[PDB]
Design a protein around this ligand. Sequence first.
Ligand SMILES: [Ca+2]
Ligand SMILES: [Mn+2]
Length: 387
Amino acid sequence: NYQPTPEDRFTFGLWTVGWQGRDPFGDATRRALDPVESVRRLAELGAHGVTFHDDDLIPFGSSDSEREEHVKRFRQALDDTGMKVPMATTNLFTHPVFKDGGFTANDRDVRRYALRKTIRNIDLAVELGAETYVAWGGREGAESGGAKDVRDALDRMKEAFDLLGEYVTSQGYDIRFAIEPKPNEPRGDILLPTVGHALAFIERLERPELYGVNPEVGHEQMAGLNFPHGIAQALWAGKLFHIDLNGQNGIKYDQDLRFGAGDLRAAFWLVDLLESAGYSGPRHFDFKPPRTEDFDGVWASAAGCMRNYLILKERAAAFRADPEVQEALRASRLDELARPTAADGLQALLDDRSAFEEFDVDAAAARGMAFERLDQLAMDHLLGARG
Ligand SMILES: [Ca+2]
Ligand SMILES: [Mn+2]
């Protein structure tokens, strides 16, 4: 019955199950959770670990002795349970100082503060065991055209990331960075709005090897993009350092539903891809139990994240192992897609009359791709009508 175990690498942010339910239009519907309780409860559900923003773990503005107590208690709960902390991040979005951004705030003093706040938490993240440090630039962007010169902003963004890379290098840390794209919300448009834009930006950093992406299901879907396709591009680039799993119904505000909700078939094809590509990173849920729920419903929603991943993993595996699917894939020429177009080389291609001058385009055109039969096998497997 689809029971999670630590090898599944399922992780959760403190801010996920800890979301109190405040929204644009609404006061909290749930009391705050102690991070130690979340670690305990998630461990009992079969999670592998947890993640945190600085300000989730240590309230903003804490004294040194309050900070020490929060960290000691958390480290303790982790040491007790065997829960890991594979990723951490900085809150560069809540405090009003970040109203125009952290790294790309127009005010230079805010950009410097953002970097110092991030570096403090990188040290803590490393201490607690994180392999990935995420950046979600949710305040980087604009509501209006004159407010933000994007080339200058990208210069500032690059400067910031490059300084963070210099910092980790100077310390000999092994931690790597991952940019979590989002196209909009809370800014009217956010910089680096998709996986593609983040991948492209990373190529211009001084040490690109230190940076990858942390794509989120719902975020790419807020641009109407195909999340599995974007993950394939990230994999192709060697940059899928981490991933955020959740659900989203289409182009609208960022819902952060439990994984499996929203676009179920996209969830199926995503799990298929991660498993068959051998992604080995965390399966992290950046989700929020709806504010309709009480704590029982929080834990049910968290369990459902994991359950749905495991159901989908079984269905995708059954699909790929079915001889009838393997024959359909061949019928649709997926194998031919894996062959070089011209391993014979350019000159041979140019001189090959069979490729062009003498190619029977009509016979090629007439060959059906057989994609609908393939996709109905996939549907039948997902729905358990096969497998
Ligand atoms: Ca996320
Ligand atoms: Mn989101």
